[PDB]
Amino acid sequence: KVVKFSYMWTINNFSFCREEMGEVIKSSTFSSGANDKLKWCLRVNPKGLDEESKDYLSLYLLLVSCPKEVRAKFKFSILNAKGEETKAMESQRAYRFVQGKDWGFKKFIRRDFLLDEANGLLPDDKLTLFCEVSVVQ
């Protein structure tokens, strides 16, 4: 049966400079509970890692631990300055995860949408991402 859980990731000192931020950044690990040993993390490319996504921030869900079979649906959103879910993007189906496999969206959010202060998505250079994971595995 599906087990649904979530993780809120606050990235501090956010910068679009690859030489300061890194090409890839990763969150701490999370799971559905203290008893759940399957560990996940989020991975962000502050600038998309291919030509197609270069004007985007790319966001992925990564299975970190070695599962004892695993499939999961996922939904990513950005939390605004008021704390609300904005710019949600979700998988249409569950995908197969093995240790080290990621799934996500290379064009999750346009960089210039984040740099537009009216949207309130980078207050104090903190980017707050929220992931909801549905593991049917």
């Binding site: 998988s91 249409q92 995908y95 197969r96 995860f97 496999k101 996500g104 969206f105």
Partner: peptide, 11 residues
């Protein structure tokens, strides 16, 4: 929106 992966296949 269709999901992508940074790697080809599993795996």
């Amino acid at each position: 929106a269709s999901a992508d992966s940074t790697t080809e296949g599993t795996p």
